[PDB]
Amino acid sequence: FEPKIVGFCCNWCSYGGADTAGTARMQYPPNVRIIRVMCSGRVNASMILKAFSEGADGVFVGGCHIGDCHYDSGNYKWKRRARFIEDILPEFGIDKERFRWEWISASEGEKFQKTMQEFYETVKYLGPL
Amino acid sequence: MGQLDKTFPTLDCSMCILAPKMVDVGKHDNIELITYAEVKEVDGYIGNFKVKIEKKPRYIDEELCTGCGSCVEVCPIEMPNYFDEGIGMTKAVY
Amino acid sequence: ARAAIPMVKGEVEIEPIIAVTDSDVCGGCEVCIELCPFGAISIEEGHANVNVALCKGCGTCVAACPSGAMDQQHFKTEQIMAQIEAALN
Amino acid sequence: ARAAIPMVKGE
Amino acid sequence: PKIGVYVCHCGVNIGGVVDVEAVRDYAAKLPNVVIAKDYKYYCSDPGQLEIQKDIKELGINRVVVAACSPRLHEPTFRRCVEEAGLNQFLFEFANIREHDSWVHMDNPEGATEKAKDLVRMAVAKARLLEPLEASKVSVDDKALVIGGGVAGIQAALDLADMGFKTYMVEKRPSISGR
Amino acid sequence: MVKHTLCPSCSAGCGVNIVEMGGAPVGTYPYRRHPVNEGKTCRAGRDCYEIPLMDRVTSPGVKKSGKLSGVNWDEALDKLTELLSSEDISILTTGTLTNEEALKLREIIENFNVKKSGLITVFPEFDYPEIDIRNIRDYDNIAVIGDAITCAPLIGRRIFHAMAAGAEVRSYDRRDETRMAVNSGFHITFSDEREVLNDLQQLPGGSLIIITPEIPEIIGPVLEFSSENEFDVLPIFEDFNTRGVMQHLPPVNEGEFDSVWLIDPGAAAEPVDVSGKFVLQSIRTEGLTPDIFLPVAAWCEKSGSYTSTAGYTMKLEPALQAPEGVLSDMEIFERILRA
Amino acid sequence: MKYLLARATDEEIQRKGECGGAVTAIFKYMLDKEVVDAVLTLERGYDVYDGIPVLLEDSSGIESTCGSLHCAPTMFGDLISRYLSDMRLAVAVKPCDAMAIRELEKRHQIDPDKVYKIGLNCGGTLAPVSAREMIETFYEIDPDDVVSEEIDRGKFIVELRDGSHREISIDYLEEEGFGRRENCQRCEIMVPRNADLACGNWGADDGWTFIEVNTERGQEIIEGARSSGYIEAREPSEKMVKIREKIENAMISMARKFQDKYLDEEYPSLDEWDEYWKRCINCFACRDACPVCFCRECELEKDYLLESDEKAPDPLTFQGVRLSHMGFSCINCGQCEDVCPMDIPIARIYHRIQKKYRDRTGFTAGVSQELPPMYSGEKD
Ligand SMILES: Cc1cc2nc3c(=O)[nH]c(=O)nc-3n(C[C@H](O)[C@H](O)[C@H](O)COP(=O)(O)OP(=O)(O)OC[C@H]3O[C@@H](n4cnc5c(N)ncnc54)[C@H](O)[C@@H]3O)c2cc1C
Ligand SMILES: Cc1cc2nc3c(=O)[nH]c(=O)nc-3n(C[C@H](O)[C@H](O)[C@H](O)COP(=O)(O)OP(=O)(O)OC[C@H]3O[C@@H](n4cnc5c(N)ncnc54)[C@H](O)[C@@H]3O)c2cc1C
Ligand code: SF4
Ligand code: SF4
Ligand code: SF4
Ligand code: SF4
Ligand code: SF4
Ligand code: SF4
Ligand code: SF4
Ligand code: SF4
Ligand code: SF4
Ligand code: FES
């Protein structure tokens, strides 16, 4: 079983974190697919639900550390949305461990690598959705 | 800088950051680049310098050459590459 | 020197990745105005209106809009939905 | 910058 | 939409892990793509010339580049397209070096599949892109210098000698610094 | 403002409320008291309020050279009466008249001695039992021919109720992914008719057969089998008063129409081939140019009775006011008889 | 005047009034002394099970709208927002109606300055046809033959036309699958404090209406009606206020128990939910009926979400999307479940999600004046 994982990362820190992990040559499983947004505040529950309905076995969202958002306060709004999404998902048979959201700074390549590896292990252990 | 692999203290790739500036220099409207040339004479003073430069013969037309490298692949003569600092080889045309 | 360069140029380009409101779809619910940290959104004629100078292009308001009247340029909902669909199909 | 100053002044 | 796809080898930085032949071939066959080419160094002058020539000849109105992170070279390819007449915002970037090739070295096949998926996502996004005219704003020809030490004094004098009106704010009653 | 009415979109007798603001229909409201659906409607039931305003043609029209031009009502009722008396006029009606209007049309048909006339419907004249859909859940065995849920969602609701009650429901169609096929206890994708009839042999006496018009050729054989064999047949007709019009008017079983008079107040008539002249009596020409056009009142602007497929009859007072210049089909029929 | 007992100075309005006719008298004063232009209320149809909204632009024959209707689970908020958002209005609202109106006002779909809310205390409503069937089966009478209903004793009480009263335990009827709608059993708000006035019969004498004045707009309404001689009012005991308080607290405790019953311990399983979702015909009756779903264009109908085939939609891209859109603001009015052609218990899941959100953030939909924390602009 090879899970399908979709990732959303903000342009300024989390996408920068993935770039840092890449430049440092930090290996991690190739299942994740990153989609760029300017801010984590651009992400809403419709995208997560569409990803899960289209065949995704896990959804990751990466944002700036609270207080480090380029756009000042988008990540707060995303955090609220993410808590509500964790509330909603289990009602339709989707474990909330399949939906992970983390704060990754532009220089935190190693944290991004570890997050990717651990999320892949979790989703694979859960099995197909 | 172009010969370095990485740079301290960040261990970032030297060429990855230098090459864009080289391209910018090569395609700037306000810059006239004269490589393989040497300043031979300087006369005059501030605001009024007359400089005579000699462009050495490449034996390759800069306007026509695309740097594809076929001539390098076909050349039979080996010679040291100045960029490799005496541990790398190239051809008479390089 | 570096500070003189742009001042000699005399102009800078603004990126156009800004919110745009569909007045025909917008209901004037106003749940988007407070979400702009720069106050780029106001209400004119009962419809949301974005100030280009104030807007920076975070996309928070667009994500908040339920009906989809608000949409970010270069990061439209249809584009991200197509990317999500292609990532899995 | 130092070379531009004289060229900006022009004299 | 006539999409032209350009996959960068980056020498062996993508090519060495990802097959820039199999990835270009898929891009040519994907709907709406009218050219698919690969070049060793696209950000260089020859690569930009190739992109401009392709735009002029085949009439490409959408440009997709499978290359390094957009945060590095998105402005580069944006000014490239314009000099060849296209609007800057019709162009898309696929990250297959920092996100795919440098992080999945031990899985070349998975790396190639991920590159294919990422290019598919990039083309899907590029299909729906539209022109956007960017607005110019004037730059005030004035400078502020905070700190009246040797560095601040030098900066203020250099700016003032270049003709710009400069303000120098100093918290101590007198300038000089340390 | 809020007035009861019937949904005209299909043959289920679902009740709705029309919300009218200043003489125009502006919305729909749940008709919770109605027994057929208890205030539940599909999308068409909630969209029906726009019908009285969409492309309404409100003026008698006679086809001048090439096109159709406005005309007064007398000058159309004349040039219709002469057409009736002189030429070979065949009167075709949809299941959208009121029962009383259908009786009046029958009266006209004999007065003008027309030979070819009737109700446009693929179902034959049968002794359909009067079934209460609320009793569908009682039947132990139900055979469904055609996608009943899509044809009439609020009858598929009763089929679901029957399923929850213990019944087995077999569905038959030429497709294998319809709503009934998905939700049926057992589905069969038959390509030959003896295929359905043979499996129908296993039904107990007094079983239900819900048949839609999606498969026309099977209706005859299935009705014959049900009559021999004692099965309660529930049809899903095409129009909201197909049953009511069938009581007075027979199904047209003719196929040589020329100089036809179509009476479709509900604008539900499918494109009918006209070899000769075309009189159209509807609420909206839309369509093709008719030789004569007689605008009429909408289903909810009339007063009269309508009968659903199950056999439930509903008497209606107008929910809206008919726009100026339009007459009910009853007025047209009475005046034509008077002339 | 947090408190008064009031009744119509008129005698016809008192006679046909449910509890002294204070609401009808207030509406009569409002139309006559011109606070407002129209009154939106209910009027019975051809029986007490048929309730129909009515918009009265004058008070002549206003008495035809008096009396309560427990078999009329109607919603007025969407009506006001869709058709009457421009006129100065006075409306009678049950707590769910006031909750919908508040959720719409904070979204600028209704102007608070334009709408006067004379809310009514509410112990629950019943579906008309279901109520008729329950009265034939358990009361052993013809449904035609009853002219009133009431739920005060914890007993559902029908009043035959002759004069007789029939009461059965609402507890025994609910256990049998009848009585109040499920959403009404879970309802936590009985007294509409989100309205300008709150009128009921809990702290009230026979012949009088107990009125709590929530706002100064309500205070102006009350003093204008009594200064104009339309309602006579006096002070409640402060022995009766405590009885009303205890009644409210015990209904509230019952709603909390029924919430536990329907949302946790008899909540459908995932397999049962799959069976239910397999039915959906994508008719959008639930969204149309939902007062919080007011949008001119709905996201659920977009190509990337709308299910374009004639089969049951994926419950994710329909129900989960609607939940993410408005479930933090769900008021548990039960309209979506009422109108569903496939008989799916939608309100259960929506109310459970809203309960999770309220527990986490403390936002109570239809009660808080401010938007849900989801829409906060602060760094909180
Ligand atoms: C003991 C000692 C001996 C040294 N000897 C030598 C030497 O022999 N040769 C040598 O080359 N270097 C020497 N240095 C180093 C030298 O002092 C520094 O390189 C140099 O002073 C840096 O100049 P500056 O303008 O950057 O900062 P500073 O000299 O510190 O000047 C900074 C200015 O900014 C002002 N300022 C600070 N905060 C604000 C504010 N918020 N708003 C406005 N103004 C503000 C300060 O008051 C001051 O006027 C020595 C340093 C020390 C400590
Ligand atoms: C369903 C329902 C349940 C109630 N439950 C309780 C309760 O448990 N405890 C309690 O103290 N009070 C309850 N009330 C209100 C109680 O009956 C009030 O004392 C009474 O409504 C006060 O009005 P009144 O007698 O002063 O005037 P009336 O003049 O009798 O006022 C009734 C007005 O309310 C409108 N109205 C009637 N029914 C509805 C309805 N279903 N939806 C919206 N508007 C409606 C009528 O059109 C009329 O305008 C309930 C009311 C309803 C409608
Ligand atoms: S063959 Fe050699 S000289 Fe000729 S274009 Fe290529 S690189 Fe230049
Ligand atoms: S959230 Fe959407 S509908 Fe509401 S005001 Fe903003 S743009 Fe208009
Ligand atoms: S996109 Fe961001 S900055 Fe722009 S108006 Fe919306 S919230 Fe404001
Ligand atoms: S475009 Fe990017 S990947 Fe390609 S050669 Fe240039 S830096 Fe390397
Ligand atoms: S089932 Fe038929 S009658 Fe009922 S609402 Fe739907 S279309 Fe109208
Ligand atoms: S949901 Fe609450 S306010 Fe609405 S009718 Fe039921 S009990 Fe009354
Ligand atoms: S589902 Fe969303 S977009 Fe549709 S009406 Fe409800 S809130 Fe508006
Ligand atoms: S989701 Fe259902 S219960 Fe909740 S507010 Fe909407 S209609 Fe009422
Ligand atoms: S009302 Fe029922 S059948 Fe219709 S869309 Fe909603 S859940 Fe589906
Ligand atoms: S920019 Fe990354 S979270 Fe706001």
Q: Give the number of other Cβ atoms within 10 Å of residue F266's Cβ.
A: 20
User: Whose CA is closest to A62, among A35, A28, A102, A32?
Assistant: A102
What span, in angstroms and rounded, lies between the C-alpha atoms of G100 and G48?
25
Q: F192's torsion region: left (phi>0), alpha (psi -120 to 50) or beta?
A: beta
What span, in angstroms and rounded, lies between the C-alpha atoms of G176 and G130?
12
Angle between helices E70-83 and E45-58 (to 10 degrees): 50
User: C46 CB contacts (<8 Å, ≥6 apart)?
Assistant: C28, G108
What span, in angstroms and rounded, lies between the C-alpha atoms of A103 and A75?
9
Residue E157 is assigned to a ligand binding site: yes
DSSP string, G169-210: EHHHHHHTT-SS-HHHHH----S-TTSSEEEESSS--TT-EE
Residues on chain E touching D2 (C-beta within 8 angstroms): 158
Question: How does strand F232-235 pair with strand F68-70?
Answer: unpaired
Q: Give the number of other Cβ atoms within 10 Å of residue C85's Cβ.
A: 18
Asked if E120 and E30 touch (Cβ cutoff 8 Å), the reply is yes
SS3 F88: coil
Q: After which residues is chain B broken (C to N over 2.5 A)?
A: none
User: F150 CB contacts (<8 Å, ≥6 apart)?
Assistant: F156, F178, F179, F180, G310
What span, in angstroms and rounded, lies between the C-alpha atoms of F292 and G275?
53
What letter would DSSP give residue G51? E
Q: B59's torsion region: left (phi>0), alpha (psi -120 to 50) or beta?
A: left
SS3 F177: coil
SS (H, E, C) chain C: CCCHHHHHHCEEEECCCCEEECCCCCCCCCCCCCCCCCCCEEEECCEEEECCCCCCCCCHHHHHCCCCCEEECCCCHHHHHHHHHHHHC
What span, in angstroms and rounded, lies between the C-alpha atoms of G156 and G168?
6
- Interface with B, mutate which of E44, E80, E97 (most B CBs under 10 A): E44
From E7, E10, E99, mutation site for ligand 6 pocket: most ligand atoms within 8 A of C-beta: E10
Q: Which residue of E has its CA nearest to B68?
A: E46
Tell me the residue type at E109. Answer: E
Name the phi and psi angles at G113, rounded to 5: -65, -20
Cβ–ligand 5 distance for C41 under 6 Å, the answer yes
* Residue C15 to residue E141, Cβ atoms within 8 A: no
Q: Give the number of other Cβ atoms within 10 Å of residue E77's Cβ.
A: 24
The ligand 10 atom nearest the CA atom of G335: 7
Count CA within 13 A, CB hemisphere, residue G15: 5
* Residue E98 to residue A35, Cβ atoms within 8 A: no
Count CA within 13 A, CB hemisphere, residue E47: 23
What span, in angstroms and rounded, lies between the C-alpha atoms of F272 and F260?
9
What span, in angstroms and rounded, lies between the C-alpha atoms of G5 and G226?
12
User: Whose CA is closest to G8, among G212, G226, G203?
Assistant: G226
What span, in angstroms and rounded, lies between the C-alpha atoms of G146 and G242?
33
User: A70 CB contacts (<8 Å, ≥6 apart)?
Assistant: A10, A11, A12, A13, A38, A39, A64, C58
What span, in angstroms and rounded, lies between the C-alpha atoms of F22 and F20?
6
What letter would DSSP give residue E130? -
F296 token code pair: 């009429």
User: Whose CA is closest to G122, among G153, G147, G151?
Assistant: G151
Q: A93's torsion region: left (phi>0), alpha (psi -120 to 50) or beta?
A: left
Distance from the CA of C68 to the center of ligand 9, in angstroms? 9
DSSP string, chain A: ----EEEEEETTTHHHHHHHHHHTT----TTEEEEEES-GGG--HHHHHHHHHHT-SEEEEEEPPTT--TTSSHHHHHHHHHHHHHHHGGGGT--GGGEEEEE--TT-HHHHHHHHHHHHHHHHHH---
Distance from the CA of G284 to the center of ligand 11, in angstroms? 5
What span, in angstroms and rounded, lies between the C-alpha atoms of B60 and E129?
44
Tell me the residue type at G294. Answer: F
What span, in angstroms and rounded, lies between the C-alpha atoms of G267 and G270?
9
The ligand 8 atom nearest the CA atom of G332: 1
Paired with B49 in beta bridges are B44
Q: What is the largest CA-CA distance in chain B?
A: 49
Rounded CA Rg of chain C: 16
Chain D within 8 Å of C7 (Cβ-Cβ)? no
Q: Where are the beta strands (DSSP E) in chain G?
A: 3-8, 38-44, 51-56, 89-93, 115-120, 146-148, 155-160, 165-169, 197-200, 209-213, 231-234
SS (H, E, C) B16-58: HHHHHHHHHHHCCCCCCCCCCEEEEEEEEECCEEEEEEEECCC
Residue ranges around ligand 1 (CB below 6 Å): E 146-152, 169-172, 177-178
Sheet of strand E3-8: strand arrangement: E33-39, E3-8, E62-67, E91-95
Q: Give the number of other Cβ atoms within 10 Å of residue E55's Cβ.
A: 23
Q: Chains touching chain B at 3 or more Cβ pairs under 8 angstroms?
A: D, E
Paired with F91 in beta bridges are F117, F261
Residues in chain F: 339
Sheet of strand G209-213: strand arrangement: G51-56, G38-44, G89-93, G115-120, G197-200, G209-213, G3-8, G231-234
Distances (CA, A) of G90 to A5, B26, G29, G104, G121: 54, 76, 11, 16, 17
G128-135 long-range contacts, Cβ below 8 Å, gap at least 24? G128/F32, G128/F33, G128/F38, G128/G49, G128/G50, G128/G51, G128/G71, G128/G72, G129/F32, G129/F33, G129/F35, G129/F38, G129/G49, G130/G178, G131/G49, G131/G70, G131/G71, G131/G178, G132/G49, G133/G178, G134/G173, G134/G178, G134/G179
User: B88 CB contacts (<8 Å, ≥6 apart)?
Assistant: B80, B81
What span, in angstroms and rounded, lies between the C-alpha atoms of E67 and E49?
16
Cis peptide, bond prior to residue B9, ω within 30 of zero:
yes
Tell me the residue type at F327. Answer: L
Q: How many residue contacts between D and E have a Cβ separation below 8 Å?
A: 11
Q: Which residue of D has its CA nearest to C4?
A: D1
Q: Chains touching chain A at 3 or more Cβ pairs under 8 angstroms?
A: C, E, G
Residues in chain E: 178
Paired with F232 in beta bridges are F208
What span, in angstroms and rounded, lies between the C-alpha atoms of E48 and G94?
69
Q: Which residue has the tokens 């209400």?
A: C43
Core vs surface per residue G91-105: b (16+ CB within 10 A) or e = bbbbbbbbbbbbbbb
User: A21 CB contacts (<8 Å, ≥6 apart)?
Assistant: A28, A109, A110, A112, A113, A116, E98, E103
User: E119 CB contacts (<8 Å, ≥6 apart)?
Assistant: E5, E7, E23, E26, E27, E30, E64, E66, E94, E96
Straight-line distance from the first to the last Cα atom of chain G, in angstroms, rounded to the nearest whole number: 37
SS3 B63: coil
Paired with F15 in beta bridges are F6
Distance from the CA of E77 to the center of ligand 5, in angstroms? 26
SS3 G38: strand
Count CA within 13 A, CB hemisphere, residue A66: 10
Residues on chain E touching B67 (C-beta within 8 angstroms): 46
Asked if G31 and G81 touch (Cβ cutoff 8 Å), the reply is no
Distance from the CA of G75 to the center of ligand 7, in angstroms? 22
Distance from the CA of E112 to the center of ligand 2, in angstroms? 69
Strand (E) or helix (H) holding E175: none
Q: Which residue of D has its CA nearest to C3?
A: D1
* Residue E45 to residue B20, Cβ atoms within 8 A: no
Angle between helices A14-23 and E70-83 (to 10 degrees): 100
Q: Give the number of other Cβ atoms within 10 Å of residue E172's Cβ.
A: 10
User: Whose CA is closest to A87, among G350, G286, G368?
Assistant: G350
What span, in angstroms and rounded, lies between the C-alpha atoms of B48 and B43?
8
What span, in angstroms and rounded, lies between the C-alpha atoms of F319 and G177?
35
Name the phi and psi angles at G78, rounded to 5: -65, -35
User: C88 CB contacts (<8 Å, ≥6 apart)?
Assistant: A4, A6, A51, A54, A55, A56
Distances (CA, A) of A81 to A46, F244, G129: 10, 55, 41
F287 token code pair: 């369509």
Asked if C13 and E78 touch (Cβ cutoff 8 Å), the reply is no
From the number of C-beta atoms within 10 Å of its C-beta (0-12, 13-18, 19+), residue F210 rates as buried
The ligand 6 atom nearest the CA atom of E9: 4
Residues on chain A touching C83 (C-beta within 8 angstroms): 35
Strand (E) or helix (H) holding G64: none
Q: Give chain D's contact residues with E (Cβ, < 8 Å).
A: 1-2, 4-5, 8-9
Q: What angle do CA B21, B24, B27 make, to 5 degrees?
A: 150
What span, in angstroms and rounded, lies between the C-alpha atoms of G99 and G291?
10
Question: How does strand G231-234 pair with strand G209-213?
Answer: unpaired
Distance from the CA of B18 to the center of ligand 6, in angstroms? 12
Q: Give the number of other Cβ atoms within 10 Å of residue G303's Cβ.
A: 8
From the number of C-beta atoms within 10 Å of its C-beta (0-12, 13-18, 19+), residue E25 rates as middle
Q: Give the number of other Cβ atoms within 10 Å of residue C20's Cβ.
A: 18
Question: Does E contact A via 3+ CB–CB distances below 8 Å?
Answer: yes
Q: Which residue of E has its CA nearest to B18?
A: E44
DSSP string, F90-145: EEEE-TTS-HHHHHHHHHHHHHTT-SSEEE--SS---------GGGGGG-SEEEEE
Question: Does C contact E via 3+ CB–CB distances below 8 Å?
Answer: yes
Distance from the CA of G222 to the center of ligand 2, in angstroms? 18
Q: Which of E43, E46, E76 has its CB closest to that of B66? A: E46
Asked if G166 and G141 touch (Cβ cutoff 8 Å), the reply is yes
From E150, E167, E174, E178, mutation site for ligand 1 pocket: most ligand atoms within 8 A of C-beta: E178
Distances (CA, A) of A22 to A15, A100, B13, E104: 11, 21, 13, 9
From B65, B75, B93, mutation site for ligand 3 pocket: most ligand atoms within 8 A of C-beta: B65
What span, in angstroms and rounded, lies between the C-alpha atoms of E41 and E17?
16
Q: Give the number of other Cβ atoms within 10 Å of residue G78's Cβ.
A: 23
What letter would DSSP give residue B4? -
Residue ranges around ligand 4 (CB below 6 Å): C 21, 26-32, 48, 65, 67, 69-70
Asked if F161 and F155 touch (Cβ cutoff 8 Å), the reply is no
Core vs surface per residue G251-270: b (16+ CB within 10 A) or e = beebbeebbeebbeeebeee
Q: Give chain C's contact residues with G (Cβ, < 8 Å).
A: 25-31, 34-37, 46, 64, 66-69, 78, 81-82, 85
User: Whose CA is closest to A74, among A103, A46, A39?
Assistant: A39
How many angstroms from the chain centroid is the CA of residue E113? 24
How many angstroms from the chain centroid is the CA of residue E24? 20
Q: How many residue contacts between C and G have a Cβ separation below 8 Å?
A: 45
What sections of F166-294 are H helices per DSSP? 179-183, 194-200, 219-227, 242-248
Q: Chains touching chain C at 3 or more Cβ pairs under 8 angstroms?
A: A, D, E, G
* Residue C89 to residue A54, Cβ atoms within 8 A: yes
Q: How many residue contacts between C and E have a Cβ separation below 8 Å?
A: 67
Ligand whose nearest atom lies closest to the CA of A73: 12
